[PDB]
Amino acid sequence: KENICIVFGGKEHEVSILTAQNVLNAIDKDKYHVDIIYITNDGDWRKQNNITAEIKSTDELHLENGEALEISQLLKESSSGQPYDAVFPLLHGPNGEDGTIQGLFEVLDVPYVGNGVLSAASSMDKLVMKQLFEHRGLPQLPYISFLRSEYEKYEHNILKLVNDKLNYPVFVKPANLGSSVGISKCNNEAELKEGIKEAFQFDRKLVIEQGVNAREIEVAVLGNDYPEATWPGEVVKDVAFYDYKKYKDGKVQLQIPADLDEDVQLTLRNMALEAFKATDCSGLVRADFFVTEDNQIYINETNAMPGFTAFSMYPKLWENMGLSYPELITKLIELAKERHQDKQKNKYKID
Amino acid sequence: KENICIVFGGKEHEVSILTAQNVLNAIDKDKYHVDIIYITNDGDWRKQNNITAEIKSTDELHLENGEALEISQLLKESSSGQPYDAVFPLLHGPNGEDGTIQGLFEVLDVPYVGNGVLSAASSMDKLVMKQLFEHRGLPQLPYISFLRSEYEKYEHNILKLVNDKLNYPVFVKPANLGSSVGISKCNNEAELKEGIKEAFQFDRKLVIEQGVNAREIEVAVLGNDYPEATWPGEVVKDVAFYDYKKYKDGKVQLQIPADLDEDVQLTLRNMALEAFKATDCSGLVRADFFVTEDNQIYINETNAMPGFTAFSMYPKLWENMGLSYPELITKLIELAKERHQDKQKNKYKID
């Protein structure tokens, strides 16, 4: 058996916990020895050893009453007594996909699924992500950015650059948040200024982005050095608007593949690979696009740890390619093994 | 008293250990309670509690025989029984300035000196660093970059782009190393190809850089949101060459301020601040420039944790401004406190 540890929760949990239930029930307990570590909202790490049956309800998860050892000892050793072959972060904290847990994993020399430090961190900062996309030549909506320090001195002058380079309406976006906290849509300077002031309560760096009305199209990418991209998918919505949040009850309504011309789909698959390379991803990414009704394409953002329930977009895009959810989980673990092995080979060849 | 922890060593140590001796002997043991954690080449963490006298020889450091508790307990609590007010990483491992230890620090919610995760990681990847410098408008030598995957398919085609955009000689540079391992200077394709092949043994991503002969000029930057830059300094060298390494015995020979026109110095101070902002630095950075004999300026790289002995360039640049080495250490701790406090204020205002 191989030795796996799923880390879930994070310093709101209900998605992460549902995800960890799905990932657990889709792992062959015959091929894998599975421990899990739950991170409480407090930040405390609680381990639960040796999952061996299906998790039918969240009650079966020890959660905050798990075994409360130091984080060092929790990750060094499987309950089986072997070191882990892969650790799978399914976190919904900021420490989830800002590169921080990945940094911990590297310091502890623990092999792990998904994106590395620089990749996760730069996909979480919206300014760095766009700067990397730009250098790579991917099309994006016209955009501006600045630090609070610059706006305190150049308010009047920054607003002019907005009206020259962009067309209203624009969106004010905090650079470093994982949440819709502080985003607003502004139809003029008056609203823009109010919006900028309003976002600086939550962040020190802002992106101003030209608005579009467009379809949201997502592509799943999987791999390390030779990644592959799925056919695109769509969350079907008769009306494009920024909701600020999923309000409709029940399952989300996916269309996979998306109802797009076959040429446009191929363009999006190739753009997804470019977006993966532009932030030097590992393991996986979801590329999220804006596609207007006249088939104009912009890349919106990448997502370094995308939604990963059994009905989420990222796994359902791979199902459409023939890759089962249990096969996808196993592939992510093998990629984690390979990236990890490739680093001692380099750390060795450095002598 | 405030509570400080110096982390030094790292998974070669002699500079880091000399540095930790200097930083220790320059801290007022009356104002600060000082513990230190030593990271062995093995990666093991060993704590030594409550430094209270001058460290006259490295023998007085417990080093690898320090107290061998789990890393979690080592950082959570000062020997005094209080949580730390600041942790000061003085590491010479890759885990030093690739953002990994900083990620650990954030996961453990430990306040810490210097650059954050994204800042350290992006200053260590030479491709991302140049891409950020470019977007900011700082002048750099003409350069190319590619992944191993791209060169395996486009060898012939990538070499042409080199000869069109650059002028020989060029330097082949691994993107992700902190070491001179795999750098070479090439006067033609024949050498370039050999050089590219030679660097791929140690890295998966490369930068090809146009060579210059120039003076090396360094500027020290200190601050968080309102940073300040020193007058520039110079390691004086009658002959510009890439040494691959300091060979001369004894002290390095600094000229502070550098023998440059007063206008050129002011330009470099302002470029240093731009370079700090371009990678969203915190705490400090050293901006390293190429300045030709005809006063043409290029930024070479930033250094997120620069040399920090008492005779290193970064502290000596601040001494020239009137800031003593003990005052600089204290300023770095206050900045660590401020960045840390500013994050709960935001994490609070996010509700």
Cα gap B139→B300, rounded to integer Å? 9
CATH code for position B56: 3.40.50.20
Segment (H or E) for B351: none
CA A147, A154, B274 angle in degrees (round to 5)? 50
Report the half-sphere exposure of A179 (CA within 13 A, side-chain side).
15
Cα gap A305→A285, rounded to integer Å? 7
Whether A71 and B70 lie within 8 Å, measured CB to CB: yes
CATH code for position B172: 3.30.1490.20
Task: Supply φ then ψ for residue A34, to 5 degrees.
Answer: -115, 120
Residues of B in contact with A121 (CB under 8 A): 99, 117-118, 121-122
CB A105 within 8 A of CB A130: no
User: In terms of domains, do B205 and B241 share one?
Assistant: no
Cβ contacts from A onto B, under 8 A: 130
Q: Is B209 annotated as a binding residue?
A: yes
CA B98 to chain A, closest CA, distance in angstroms equals 8
Domain boundary pick from A194, A210, A226: A210
User: In terms of domains, do B149 and B107 share one?
Assistant: no
CB A221 within 8 A of CB A285: yes
User: In terms of domains, do B256 and B323 share one?
Assistant: yes
User: In terms of domains, do A321 and A230 share one?
Assistant: yes
User: In terms of domains, do A256 and A198 share one?
Assistant: no
> Kind of pairing, strands A2-9 and A86-91?
parallel
CB A283 within 8 A of CB A335: yes
User: In terms of domains, do A159 and A239 share one?
Assistant: no
Q: Give the method used.
A: X-ray
- Residue A189 is among the residues annotated as catalytic for this protein: no
Cα gap B95→B120, rounded to integer Å? 10
Q: Which two tokens stand for residue A60?
A: 């079966």
Residues pairing with A9 in the sheet: A39, A91
**Residue B133, Cα to own-chain centre: how many angstroms?**
16
Q: Which two tokens stand for residue B159?
A: 């070499």
CB A131 within 8 A of CB B131: yes
Cα gap A239→A309, rounded to integer Å? 25
Please indicate, yes or no, if residue A274 is contained in any of the structural domains: yes
Amino acid at B174: P
Whether A103 and B103 lie within 8 Å, measured CB to CB: yes
Give the number of other CB atoms < 10 A from CB of residue A277. 19
Of the candidates B103, B225, B350, the beta carbon closest to that of A149 is on B225
Q: Which two tokens stand for residue B105?
A: 């620090």
Cα gap A178→A97, rounded to integer Å? 8
User: In terms of domains, do A220 and A336 share one?
Assistant: yes
> E-assigned strands of A10-57?
32-39, 45-51
Of the candidates B121, B179, B277, the beta carbon closest to that of A99 is on B121
Sign of CA dihedral B161, B163, B164, B167: positive
Q: Which two tokens stand for residue A293?
A: 């009704």
Q: Is A214 annotated as a binding residue?
A: yes
Into how many domains does chain B fold?
3
Q: Which two tokens stand for residue B11?
A: 């998974």
CB B215 within 8 A of CB B238: no
User: In terms of domains, do B192 and B237 share one?
Assistant: no
CA A28 to chain B, closest CA, distance in angstroms equals 30
Task: Supply φ then ψ for residue A24, to 5 degrees.
Answer: -70, -45
User: In terms of domains, do A323 and A221 share one?
Assistant: yes
Residues of B in contact with A102 (CB under 8 A): 103
Minimal-distance CA residue of chain B relative to A120:
B118
Please list the active-site residues of B. 12, 179, 312
Cα gap A115→A102, rounded to integer Å? 8
Cα gap A116→A107, rounded to integer Å? 12
Cα gap B236→B256, rounded to integer Å? 10
Q: Is B79 annotated as a binding residue?
A: no
Q: Is B303 annotated as a binding residue?
A: yes
Q: Which two tokens stand for residue B182?
A: 């795999």
Give the number of other CB atoms < 10 A from CB of residue B103. 30
Site from B42, B100, B105, B345 to mutate, A interface, most A CB atoms within 10 angstroms: B100
Residues of A in contact with B107 (CB under 8 A): 71, 95, 100-101, 103-104
Domain boundary pick from B155, B179, B210: B210
User: In terms of domains, do B88 and B199 share one?
Assistant: no
Please enumerate in sequence order all residues whose Cβ is within 8 A of that of B242, keeping only pairs 6 or more positions apart, or say none. B171, B183, B185
- Residue A274 is among the residues annotated as catalytic for this protein: no
Please indicate, yes or no, if residue A181 is contained in any of the structural domains: yes
User: In terms of domains, do A182 and A75 share one?
Assistant: no
Q: Which two tokens stand for residue B115?
A: 């650059």
Q: Which two tokens stand for residue B276?
A: 């700090």
Please indicate, yes or no, if residue A287 is contained in any of the structural domains: yes
Q: What is the DSSP string of A199-225?
A: HTTT-SEEEEEE----EEEEEEEEESS
Whether B132 and A134 lie within 8 Å, measured CB to CB: no
Cα gap B266→B291, rounded to integer Å? 13
Domain boundary pick from B186, B210, B234: B210
User: In terms of domains, do B160 and B75 share one?
Assistant: no
CA A289, A290, A293 angle in degrees (round to 5)? 135
Cα gap A220→A269, rounded to integer Å? 9
Cα gap B351→B346, rounded to integer Å? 9
CB B174 within 8 A of CB B206: yes
Cα gap B308→B328, rounded to integer Å? 11
In the numeric block, the tokens 């990222």 are attached to: A314
Q: Which domain holds residue A33?
A: 2-112
Cα gap B102→B91, rounded to integer Å? 11
In the numeric block, the tokens 């799925």 are attached to: A230
Closest by CA position to B205, among listed B173, B179, B183: B173
Of the candidates B70, B135, B203, the beta carbon closest to that of A72 is on B70
Q: What is the DSSP string of A259-323?
A: S--HHHHHHHHHHHHHHHHHTT--EEEEEEEEE-TT--EEEEEEESS---STTSHHHHHHHHTT-
Q: Which two tokens stand for residue B32?
A: 């600060």
How many separate helices (H) and strands (E) can be counted in chain B? 10, 14
Cα gap A48→A62, rounded to integer Å? 6
The alpha-carbon radius of gyration of chain A (Å, integer) is 21
Task: Supply φ then ψ for residue B62, to 5 degrees.
Answer: -70, -25
Cα gap A271→A232, rounded to integer Å? 11
**What are the strands of the beta sheet with B2-9, ordered from one edge?**
B45-51, B32-39, B2-9, B86-91
